[PDB]
Structure 1
Amino acid sequence: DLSLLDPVLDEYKGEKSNIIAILQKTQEIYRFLPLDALNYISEKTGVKKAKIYGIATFYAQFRLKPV
């Protein structure tokens, strides 16, 4: 699913400096950061995909595998 992230992306829109909060919300929702969800964030918010993956893999709290 991708509509679950629709409220979050609507709350943190207008500024591309809130990507970590969106990633944390996605981590809470899906329990992990699937590449399709990261793609949806990259498309909706307008931040480059490499930045998304870097900020996602920087922290040990973010896991990219299903739990």
Structure 2
Amino acid sequence: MAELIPVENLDVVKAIVAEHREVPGCLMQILQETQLKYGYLPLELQGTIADELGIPLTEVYGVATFYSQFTLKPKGKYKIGICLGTACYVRGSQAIIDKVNSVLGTQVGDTTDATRCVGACGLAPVMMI
């Protein structure tokens, strides 16, 4: 799904940036497209797409930091999703977190994710690789 850096930046930014109206507008529409096929929003390439648009970086970086509608950089190789919703907090998974803290590495929030309820609440907790 994620075809790395070069060809996608070129293909997607030489195709659907050059339109009229929607001043940021459809740029948010391509922002979700980035998280449709990158999983993150590139740091040094906002400058590239902005110099293509000819508009500075403060407003697009402000859009990026304003909404929590997408994700950022931190992705080492894998992700470990512990289901900790309200029904899962009734079950609880704190000893499992303590277990991985003594073997795998650091506590929640740092790469070596947090998930809302996704379904199948009867088998709490859920480990998502």
Q: Given the superposition, is the C-alpha separation of residues 64 and 29 from structure 1 closer, same or farther in structure 2, using an over 3 Å criterion?
A: same
Q: Which runs of 5+ in 2 are unaligned?
A: 1-5, 76-129
Determine which of 39, 48, 61 is the counterpart of 1:31.
39
Structure having the higher strand fraction is: 2
Show the 5 A alignment for 1:49-60.
49-60=57-68
In 2: Cα distance, 1:29 partner to 1:46 partner: 24
Whole-angstrom distance in 2 between the partners of 1:24 and 1:36: 18
Report the CA distance shift for 1:23/1:55 in structure 2 as closer, same or farther (over 3 A): same
Aligned residues: 65
Paired amino acid for 1:50: T
Provide TM-score, normalisation by structure 2: 0.42
CA offset at residue 9 of structure 1?
1.5
Q: Distance in 2 between matches of 1:22 and 1:49?
A: 16
Q: Which has the higher contact order (CA 8 A, sep 6+)?
A: 1
Q: Which amino acid aligns with 1:38?
A: Q
Alignment of 1:1-67 (within 5 A): 1=6, 2-6=9-13, 7-10=15-18, 13-15=19-21, 16-18=23-25, 19-67=27-75
**Unaligned stretches of 5+ residues in structure 1:** none
Separation in structure 2 between the aligned mates of residue 29 and residue 3 of structure 1, nearest angstrom = 14
Q: CA RMSD for the aligned pairs?
A: 1.9
Identity %: 34
Distance in 1 separating the partners of 2:50 and 2:24: 13
Tell me which stretches of 4 or more aligned residues in structure 1 moved more than 4 Å: none
TM-score, scaled relative to structure 1: 0.71
